């Protein structure tokens, strides 16, 4: 199994969002459930600007490719800027949130190593 | 721990690269050799005009994140054309390939649900 996906493969699929967490909407491309792949799932997340992917932690460990706009990310309490070019790291269970305080959309990849996403059981830090 | 990367924060880091691989050059981002991170590792690679990264395989699944350019990927023998802002799923063991025979630099990141990429042995294939 090998294949390429982008935003005009995934265009039948609806996004996803929640009333929890105005500003964010969110699409999988590499995904069991959608796919069959394993080892790897990524998808494709965008944060309005004001948005906020609040503070929060999951055991899988996490790598965020940021492909569009700028972000203040929170490094368990330290800030720090994120743009366009940037990839992110985030141990398993260390808590990140991820706020959009600029003019573009901030938009960018999320990889983790499960099978899918939506086995990846996400707590509130508060 | 939490941290951020992108091309400028690894000038320190000499490009690495291999004959096998003609016109291929990468740096380590995301790498416990580099960063004692763990869980999934990234890197970035250039493919020059020309260049081949020739048809091989590792038990790892990996995923590509084509941030610039054009290639041609090698589906296990089946080719499709690869551009900036697609993404690839290779599952573990599948045999691919990929080559630039355009103008500009082929770029991508790579991912692996190891911690490091001296855990990814590659084979050659057919
Ligand atoms: C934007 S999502 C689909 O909620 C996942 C983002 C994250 O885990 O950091
Ligand atoms: C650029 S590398 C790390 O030599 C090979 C990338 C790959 O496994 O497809
Ligand atoms: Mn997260
Ligand atoms: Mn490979």
């Known amino acids: 199994?090998?294949?390429?996906?982008?935003?005009?493969?995934?265009?039948?699929?609806?996004?996803?969002?929640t009333e929890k967490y105005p500003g964010v909407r969110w699409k999988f491309l590499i995904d069991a459930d959608?796919?069959?792949?394993?080892?790897?799932?990524?998808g494709f997340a965008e944060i309005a600007p004001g948005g906020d992917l609040t503070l929060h932690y999951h055991s899988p460990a996490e790598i965020?490719?940021?492909?569009?706009?700028?972000?203040?990310?929170?490094?368990?309490?330290?800030l720090?800027?994120?743009?366009?070019?940037?990839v992110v790291y985030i141990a398993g269970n260390a808590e990140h949130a991820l706020k959009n305080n600029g003019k573009e959309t901030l938009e960018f990849y999320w990889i983790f190593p499960t099978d899918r996403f939506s086995e990846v059981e996400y707590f509130p830090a508060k």
Chains 1, 2 share one sequence.
């Open 80 to 86: 720090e800027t994120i743009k366009k070019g940037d």
């Open 64 to 78: 965020a490719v940021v492909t569009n706009g700028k972000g203040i990310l929170n490094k368990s309490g330290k």
């Open 34 to 42: 959608f796919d069959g792949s394993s080892g790897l799932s990524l």
């Open 1 to 17: 199994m090998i294949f390429v996906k982008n935003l005009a493969s995934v265009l039948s699929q609806e996004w996803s969002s």
